[PDB]
From a paper:
Previous studies indicated that the small [name] ([name]) is associated with the [name]-type gallate decarboxylase LpdC (lp_2945) in Lactobacillus plantarum. The crystal structure of the purified [name] reveals a dimeric protein with structural similarity to the eukaryotic heterodimeric proteasome assembly chaperone Pba3/4. Solution studies demonstrate that [name] protein specifically binds to reduced prFMN species only. The addition of the [name]–prFMNH2 complex supports reconstitution and activation of the purified E. coli apo-[name] in vitro, leading to modest 3,4-dihydroxybenzoic acid decarboxylation. These observations suggest that [name] acts as a prFMNH2-binding chaperone, enabling apo-[name] activation through enhanced prFMNH2 incorporation and subsequent oxidative maturation.
Given both H35 and H61 are strictly conserved, we made [name] [name] and H61A variants to test for the effect of an intact metal-binding site on prFMNH2 binding. In the case of the [name] variant, crystals belonged to a different space group (P41212) containing only one molecule in the asymmetric unit. As with the WT structure, a functional and highly similar dimer can be made by applying crystallographic symmetry. No electron density for Mn2+ could be observed, but residual electron density was observed and assigned to a bound phosphate near H61. While the distinct crystallization conditions and crystal packing likely contribute to the observed changes, it is clear the presence of H35 is essential for metal binding and associated loop conformations. When tested using whole-cell decarboxylation assays, both variants displayed reduced activity when compared with WT [name] whole-cell assays, with [name] more affected than H61A. In vitro reconstitution of the purified H61A variant reveals this mutation does not abolish prFMNH2 binding, whereas the purified [name] variant did not bind prFMNH2 under the conditions used. This suggests that His35—and by extension metal binding—is more important for [name] function in vivo compared with H61, although neither are essential under the conditions tested.
Numbering used by the authors:
A (entry chain A), B (entry chain A): 1 to 120
Write the structure that this text describes.
Amino acid sequence: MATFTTEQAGYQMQAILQVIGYDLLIVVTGGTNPHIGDVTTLTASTVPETVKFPSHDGRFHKDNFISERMAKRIQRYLAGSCTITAGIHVNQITKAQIAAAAPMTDDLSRQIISWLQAHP
Amino acid sequence: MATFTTEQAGYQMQAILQVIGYDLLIVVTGGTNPHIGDVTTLTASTVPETVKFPSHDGRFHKDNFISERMAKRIQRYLAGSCTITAGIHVNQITKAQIAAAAPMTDDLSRQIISWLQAHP
């Protein structure tokens, strides 16, 4: 249904939003290698819950800070269920990139909130 | 990336598949009202796990039998993580529709397996 991008100092993240009835599905990725490392689910009135996927070396992917952050930002605007995937390869990128991805996620979230307000 | 439909005695289900890098995202819906009631996650080597969304009257949605069934059918063909949503309003449809949706899910799953084998 809709694609958004955000950029901070050369690093780019993207969010693809799909409206499935009253329910939402959002894929958040970054850099040049799309991936799903974590999934966070929520409704307007329940606390978001995360499932982590295993990485190749056995560690769980820690990209859930992205999906949980977006979940917290958009929660009050949800008409139904919401499923958010995240994957920016936090196990491979620099600490500065990981830190920058938090305000970048806030920017994608506001872009999404605006789009939802314009397409209720 | 790809859409599939299946039909049994007038009832239709649909699966939208998205390839996100090596990872998969599949939305399974049915009838005339798309929805996400449940989410099942898996990899080729881990048992699928489900999160259920609450319905309006407080009962968890029970459409996860759909996503878990598809997960079991396609698991051995996965290159990475896989996230499957399901929602056919099992809390509103007839018992016969609920029962028919299980072989319909197997048909969508094979359609997906074929598409994956043709687009590795």
